[PDB]
Amino acid sequence: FSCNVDGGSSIGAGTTSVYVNLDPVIQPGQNLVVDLSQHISCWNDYGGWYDTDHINLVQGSAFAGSLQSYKGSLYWNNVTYPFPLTTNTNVLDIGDKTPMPLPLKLYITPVGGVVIKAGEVIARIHMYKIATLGSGNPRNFTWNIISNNSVVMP
Ligand SMILES: O=C(O)c1cc(-c2ccccc2O[C@@H]2O[C@H](CO)[C@H](O)[C@H](O)[C@H]2O)cc([N+](=O)[O-])c1
Ligand SMILES: O=C(O)c1cc(-c2ccccc2O[C@@H]2O[C@H](CO)[C@H](O)[C@H](O)[C@H]2O)cc([N+](=O)[O-])c1
């Protein structure tokens, strides 16, 4: 099982930064929408749904410390969860060799000028993989989400 970010090197586990582009200006009462499906894609390394991979996001996925007061909802594979995650999410099965954009979005409500600083971590999303055959070769991933640009709110 592997993923990449913006079509870069293949990733089988571990921590990777994911750089996003956000609307530079938002109004009071407006949320930021981070569509991670545009950045992270994953696939099964055999194809044909041989040794199908089972992927979920993990309780403890959270905002960056600086943004701890923010509110959020996380969309994963047809379901929306409050963020930070206090439960794991549903499981997404991956079996094609052709990369699948991850069905992952984050909706962020700023609480408490600059609402997002360019270059700062926004959120840390933990992901778990286990496959079907043998031990399933469980793997842990972290996606550290970072904006390329600042966002301001009047
Ligand atoms: O385990 C890894 O860390 C890892 C494995 C592989 C890989 C490459 C070639 C063939 C099979 C591979 O892994 C198996 O894939 C199964 C179906 O997805 C299934 O996931 C199996 O459990 C798995 O062993 C690639 C990378 N990579 O980042 O390019 C990473
Ligand atoms: O090892 C497992 O069985 C397992 C691991 C994870 C996981 C994936 C990604 C990042 C962190 C993860 O678990 C945390 O690991 C901490 C120690 O490193 C620490 O042990 C935390 O308690 C733990 O939650 C998810 C699942 N899962 O089923 O979604 C299972």
Query: Please, which experimental method was used?
Result: X-ray
What is the residue whose two structure tokens read 């550290």?
A: 144
Distance CA 107, CA 31 (A): 6
What gap in Å lies between CA 117 and CA 51, rounded to an integer? 41
Atom of ligand 1 nearest to the CA of 44: 18
In a 3-state reduction of DSSP, which class is residue 37? helix
Does ligand 2 lie within 6 Å of residue 88's CB atom?
Answer: yes
Mention the CATH class of domain 1-154.
mainly beta
Q: Are 16 and 143 in contact (CB under 8 A)?
A: yes
Number of alpha carbons in the 13 Å side-chain half-sphere of residue 92: 24
Domains of the chain, by residue range, sit at 1-154
In the structure encoding, which two tokens stand for residue 18, read together? 């994911």
Hey, what amino acid is at 22? L
CB 59 within 8 A of CB 7: no
**Resolution given for this structure, in angstroms:** 1.1
Q: Are strands 14-20 and 139-147 parallel, antiparallel or unpaired?
A: parallel
Q: How far is CA 130 from CA 30, 111, 136, 144, in A?
A: 37, 36, 5, 21
Quick one: which H or E segment has residue 116?
strand 114-116
Q: What DSSP character marks residue 11?
A: B
Kindly state the greatest CA–CA separation across the chain: 55
- Could you tell me if the CB of 141 is within 6 A of ligand 1? no
